[PDB]
RNA sequence: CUUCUGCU
RNA sequence: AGUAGUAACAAGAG
C-alpha cells in the first residue's frame, strides 16, 4: 500500500495486447477490482495480515 | 556481448566442471496420472524383444508364456533377449575356474544365512504387494497379513520364526486347494487354487517418480510377500559371490565403492603391457531388465549350487521359477473425459481386457491390442524379461562373468579385456597391440554379450583412450572427480523433525566438505543459507527479530525471559553458533555451557510428551534419497530434546473402507506399548518366546510384585491388589 | 447440506 | 482458460 501510494501517475487502464485463447474482458476488471480492494483495505479496515 | 557459460569448457576440462552440466537445482520431472500405459508398453517391449521364442501355455495359471532361450542368434544390432544356455553355463564355468572355490565358499556362507535368518527380516524394506488386498502395503503389514491368512488356513509352520519355515508354508499354500481371506463389514472371500496362484505371482506396477536425467518416464514393479522370501536368499548368495569378484562394484557403497573402483582400475591399467595399446569403453546396456530372462538366472543358480544339498538348491532356485511365471498387474487404469458432456471417469485396468477400443487414441489402442492376448484376470503374463528385477547382484555376477571371459587365457588372441560392472552400467578396458586388435576385441565382447542376451547400448556409449571414463555417474579423469551437484538435493531442511533437521543439515555440510569437495568459504555460506531456510521453515526466527509469524509470540516471550540468549537453541530463536570449527558437535551439547539452568531443564525434561522412542533400529536414523540411487540410512548425532517430536500421520485412510486396518494398527500399538511397560528391553533387543503376550506380562507382573514386596518398594495392600488383578486377568482370558 | 482428507 | 506433456490438474469421498 505504501509503495502504491508512492506513485502519483495512475491513469485509467486500457488493454493493449489481448490473450487469444482467453476471455479478456476479465483481466481489465481484475486489475480494477484489485485497485478497489486496495482502496477498501487502505481507506479503512484493520489492514489485515492477509486479504 | 552474448554471455555463454558453455564456452567455459574451452579452458576448464569438462570433468573438472561437470557439476555445471547438472540441472539438479530445478524440480525433478514427476509422473502425472496412472502407470498403466508405461507398464503395458514395458510388457509389449519385453515380448517384442523375444518375439522369435517359443510360445507355451502354463498348465497351472493358464496364461501364455514366451521362452526366448536358445532362440535364433541376433541378426541385427537390435536389442535381443535370445540368450543361449550353453554360453551362460560356459561363462559361469570359466568364472569358477578363474576364481576357484568362489561358488563353494559363497554357498557355504549363504547356507548358514538360510539357517539363521528369521521371518522378521522380511519387515525390512517398503511397498510390498499385499495379495490379500491387491494393493501395496508396508512390508511389515503385508507380512503380518500373509501370516494371519496362512494361520487361518491351517499353515501353522511359520511359528518357528525361521524364514525357511515361512517359505515352506508358502510352498504348501501353493499346493492348497482353496484359500480363505478376510475383508472389511468383515466379510470372508474364498480363492480357488488358480486364482491364488495368479495373485501370488502377481507384481504390482507404478511409475518411478522424481527421476532425473530422463525425458520419458518409466514403470517400476514391486513383488508380493511370497516372492520376497526367496528373493532375499538369492540376493544374499549373489552378494556373497559379488564380494569376491574384483570387477563387481555393486555390493559396496559410498567411499568404499569409489575406493574399490579406483584400486581395481589402477591395477588393471598397471598390469597392462607397455607395448599394448589400451582403450576404455563407457556406456550402459539398452533394455537391461527387459532382456535379462529369469531362466538364465535359474541356470546360473543351478550351476552355482552344484554339489550343494538338494534343499539348498531348491530354496535358491524357487525364486527364478516364480519370477519366470510372474504376472504384472497393469495398475491404476485409464482416465476418460467428455468435453461436450463435461464429465470425467476412470476405467480400472481390470476392464481393459473387455472394454471397447474406440475410447483410446491410436498409440494406446495399439498397446491394448498388442497386450490383449496376454491379459489374464486383469494381469498380463510376463514370463520373458525381468520387470524391475531385484536380481541386481545376480545380473552383476553375470556381467562380471562376461567381463572375466576377456582374459588373455580365454581370448586365446593378442587382444584382451577387463573392467567394471554394476547392474546395467559398465566400463570396459581393452588392451590390444593395435587399433585393429582393439576393434576385434570390442566386436568379440559385444557379440559375447549378445550371446548371453546382454547388449551394449551403442546409442549412449563411446570409446576413447584409456585414462578417462564414466561409471555410475562417477567421472574418472585419471582419478575420480568430486562431483558436487549430485549432492545438492541433500542440502536444505531434511524434514525429519525440528531437532533432527539441524543435526542432519550440519552433518550433510560436514560430509560434503569431506567427500564432495566443498570449499570452506562455500561451506560457510551454505551453513548460513541452511540456517536461514531452517528458520523460515520451522518459524524459529530470532527472538529479537521483528518478523511476524504465528509462533512469534512464544519465541519472543522465551527470548525476553532467558538471561543468556546465546544458550537458546536455534529452534528456540537462539543465535547460530555453528562454524567450520564445530560442524560435528550436536547443538544441544554445543550450547550446554551457555544454556540457562531453568531452560536447560525444561528442554531436556525426559517426561516431556513430544519425545517418543521406537525400536533402536529407528533411533537417531533417517532415510534420505539422494539425486541418484535408492534410499539410504543416514545416522545423525542428536540429543533427546522436546524438539525431537514426531509429525502428524496421513489420515486419508480414515474415510475409506480400509480404515479398519488403521484401527487394528492402533490396537497393536496399544498392546506393544503396554508390553514395553512390562519388558523394558523389548525395544533394545527383540524378545523371544512361544507363550502368549498376556501370559508373559502376567507372569512378569507377579514376579515383579513379589520382588518389590520383598525389597519393600510396595506395601502389603498394593501387593494384594496386584495379585487380585492378575488372578482376574487369568480368569478373563479363560472365560473368553 | 453437513462430515472427512491434501502421499493411501 | 491455465498448468502441463504420452497424462494429469483445473477438488475428492461420503
Amino acid at each position: 500500500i505504501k509503495c502504491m501510494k508512492t506513485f502519483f501517475g495512475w491513469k485509467e487502464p486500457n488493454i493493449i495486447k489481448p490473450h487469444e485463447k482467453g476471455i479478456n474482458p476479465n483481466y481489465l476488471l481484475t486489475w480494477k477490482q484489485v485497485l478497489a480492494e486496495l482502496q477498501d483495505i487502505e481507506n479503512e479496515e484493520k489492514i489485515p495480515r492477509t486479504k | 556481448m552474448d554471455v555463454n557459460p558453455t564456452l567455459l569448457f574451452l579452458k576448464v576440462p569438462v570433468q573438472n566442471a561437470i557439476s555445471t552440466t547438472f540441472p539438479y537445482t530445478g524440480d525433478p520431472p514427476y509422473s502425472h496420472g496412472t502407470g498403466t500405459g508405461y507398464t503395458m508398453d514395458t510388457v509389449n517391449r519385453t515380448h517384442k524383444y523375444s518375439e522369435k521364442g517359443k510360445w507355451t501355455t502354463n498348465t497351472e495359471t493358464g496364461a501364455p508364456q514366451l521362452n526366448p532361450i536358445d532362440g535364433p542368434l541376433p541378426e541385427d544390432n537390435e536389442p535381443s533377449g535370445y540368450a543361449q544356455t550353453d554360453c551362460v553355463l560356459e561363462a559361469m564355468a570359466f568364472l569358477e575356474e578363474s576364481h576357484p572355490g568362489i561358488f563353494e565358499n559363497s554357498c557355504l556362507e549363504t547356507m548358514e544365512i538360510v539357517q539363521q535368518t528369521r521371518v522378521d527380516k522380511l519387515t525390512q524394506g517398503r511397498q510390498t504387494y499385499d495379495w490379500t488386498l491387491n494393493r501395496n502395503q508396508p512390508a511389515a503389514t503385508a507380512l503380518a497379513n500373509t501370516i494371519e491368512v496362512f494361520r487361518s488356513n491351517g499353515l501353522t509352520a511359520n511359528e518357528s520364526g525361521r524364514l525357511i519355515d515361512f517359505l515352506k508354508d508358502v510352498m504348501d499354500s501353493m499346493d492348497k486347494e482353496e484359500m480363505e481371506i478376510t475383508t472389511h463389514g468383515k466379510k470372508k472371500q474364498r480363492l480357488n487354487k488358480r486364482s491364488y496362484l495368479i495373485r501370488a505371482l502377481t507384481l504390482n506396477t507404478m511409475t518411478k517418480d522424481a527421476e532425473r536425467g530422463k525425458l520419458k518416464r518409466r514403470a517400476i514393479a514391486t513383488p508380493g510377500m511370497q516372492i520376497r522370501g526367496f528373493v532375499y536368499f538369492v540376493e544374499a548368495l549373489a552378494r556373497s559371490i559379488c564380494e569376491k569378484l574384483e570387477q563387481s562394484g555393486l555390493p559396496v557403497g559410498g567411499n568404499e565403492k569409489k575406493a574399490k573402483l579406483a584400486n581395481v582400475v589402477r591395477k588393471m591399467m598397471t598390469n597392462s603391457q607397455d607395448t599394448e595399446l589400451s582403450f576404455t569403453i563407457t556406456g550402459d546396456n539398452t533394455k537391461w531388465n527387459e532382456n535379462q530372462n529369469p531362466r538364465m538366472f535359474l541356470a546360473m543358480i543351478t550351476y552355482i549350487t552344484r554339489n550343494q544339498p538338494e534343499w539348498f538348491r531348491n530354496v535358491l532356485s524357487i525364486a527364478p521359477i516364480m519370477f519366470s511365471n510372474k504376472m504384472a498387474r497393469l495398475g491404476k487404469g485409464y482416465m476418460f473425459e467428455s468435453k461436450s458432456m463435461k464429465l470425467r471417469t476412470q476405467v480400472p485396468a481390470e476392464m481393459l481386457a473387455n472394454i471397447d477400443l474406440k475410447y483410446f487414441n491410436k498409440s494406446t489402442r495399439e498397446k491394448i491390442e498388442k497386450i490383449r492376448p496376454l491379459l489374464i484376470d486383469g494381469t498380463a503374463s510376463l514370463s520373458p524379461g525381468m520387470m524391475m528385477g531385484m536380481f541386481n547382484m545376480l545380473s552383476t555376477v553375470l556381467g562380471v562373468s562376461i567381463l572375466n571371459l576377456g582374459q588373455k587365457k580365454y581370448t586365446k588372441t593378442t587382444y584382451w579385456w577387463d573392467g567394471l560392472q554394476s547392474s546395467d552400467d559398465f566400463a570396459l578396458i581393452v588392451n590390444a597391440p593395435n587399433h585393429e586388435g582393439i576393434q576385434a576385441g570390442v566386436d568379440r565382447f559385444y557379440r559375447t554379450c549378445k550371446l548371453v542376451g546382454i547388449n551394449m547400448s551403442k546409442k549412449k556409449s563411446y570409446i576413447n583412450r584409456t585414462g578417462t571414463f564414466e561409471f555410475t555417474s562417477f567421472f574418472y579423469r585419471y582419478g575420480f572427480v568430486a562431483n558436487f551437484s549430485m549432492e545438492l538435493p541433500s542440502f536444505g531442511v531434511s524434514g525429519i523433525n525440528e531437532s533432527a533437521d539441524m543435526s542432519v543439515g550440519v552433518t550433510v555440510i560436514k560430509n560434503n566438505m569431506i567427500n564432495n569437495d566443498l570449499g570452506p568459504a562455500t561451506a560457510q555460506m551454505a551453513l548460513q543459507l541452511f540456517i536461514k531456510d531452517y528458520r523460515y521453515t520451522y518459524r524459529c526466527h530470532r527472538g529479537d527479530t521483528q518478523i511476524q509469524t504465528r509462533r512469534a509470540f512464544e519465541l519472543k516471550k522465551l527470548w525476553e525471559q532467558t538471561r543468556s540468549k546465546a544458550g537458546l537453541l536455534v529452534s528456540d530463536g537462539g543465535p547460530n553458533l555453528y562454524n567450520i570449527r564445530n560442524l560435528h558437535i550436536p547443538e544441544v551439547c554445543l550450547k550446554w555451557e551457555l544454556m540457562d539452568e531453568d531452560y536447560q531443564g525444561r528442554l531436556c525434561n525426559p517426561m516431556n510428551p513430544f519425545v517418543s522412542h521406537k525400536e533402536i533400529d529407528s533411533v537417531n536414523n533417517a532415510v534420505v534419497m539422494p539425486a541418484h540411487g535408492p534410499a539410504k540410512s543416514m545416522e545423525y548425532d542428536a540429543v533427546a530434546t522436546t524438539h525431537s517430536w514426531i509429525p502428524k500421520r496421513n489420515r486419508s485412510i480414515l474415510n475409506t473402507s480400509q480404515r479398519g486396518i488403521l484401527e487394528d494398527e492402533q490396537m497393536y500399538q496399544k498392546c506393544c506399548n503396554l508390553f514395553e511397560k512390562f519388558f523394558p528391553s523389548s525395544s533394545y533387543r527383540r524378545p523371544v518366546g512361544i507363550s502368549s503376550m498376556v501370559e508373559a506380562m502376567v507372569s512378569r507382573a507377579r514376579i515383579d510384585a513379589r520382588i518389590d514386596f520383598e525389597s519393600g518398594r510396595i506395601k502389603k495392600e498394593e501387593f494384594a491388589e496386584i495379585m487380585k488383578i492378575c488372578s482376574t486377568i487369568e480368569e478373563l482370558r479363560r472365560q473368553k
Side-chain angles (χ1 to χ4, degrees), chain B residues 168-186:
Chain B
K168 277 163 95 52
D169 294 357
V170 165
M171 273 185 348
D172 289 335
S173 93
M174 209 86 44
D175 276 305
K176 220 69 180 164
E177 71 289 354
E178 185 159 52
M179 270 274 171
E180 271 176 79
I181 39 173
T182 60
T183 306
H184 40 297
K186 224 198 183 142

Side-chain angles (χ1 to χ4, degrees), chain B residues 648 650-652 655:
Chain B
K648 171 186 64 74
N650 199 307
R651 327 164 48 86
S652 211
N655 67 355

Side-chain angles (χ1 to χ4, degrees), chain B residues 38-53:
Chain B
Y38 314 127
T39 298
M40 282 207 287
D41 196 20
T42 291
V43 168
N44 290 345
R45 262 151 48 122
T46 297
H47 282 270
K48 177 229 300 186
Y49 294 160
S50 303
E51 63 188 338
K52 273 190 303 287

Side-chain angles (χ1 to χ4, degrees), chain B residues 464-533:
Chain B
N464 55 256
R465 195 65 74 107
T466 299
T468 81
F469 67 90
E470 170 269 351
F471 182 78
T472 83
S473 64
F474 298 158
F475 301 93
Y476 183 96
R477 182 163 198 278
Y478 322 113
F480 283 104
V481 312
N483 176 4
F484 175 63
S485 298
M486 202 95 70
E487 311 303 7
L488 265 178
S490 199
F491 283 58
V493 162
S494 95
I496 288 328
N497 87 19
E498 205 166 50
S499 167
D501 268 297
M502 184 84 77
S503 166
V504 159
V506 286
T507 293
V508 156
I509 288 156
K510 183 233 305 184
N511 288 358
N512 279 273
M513 314 198 51
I514 295 170
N515 314 336
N516 291 96
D517 177 1
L518 193 72
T522 313
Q524 301 211 304
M525 181 154 198
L527 174 62
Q528 292 187 285
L529 294 173
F530 164 72
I531 289 311
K532 202 167 60 59
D533 195 354

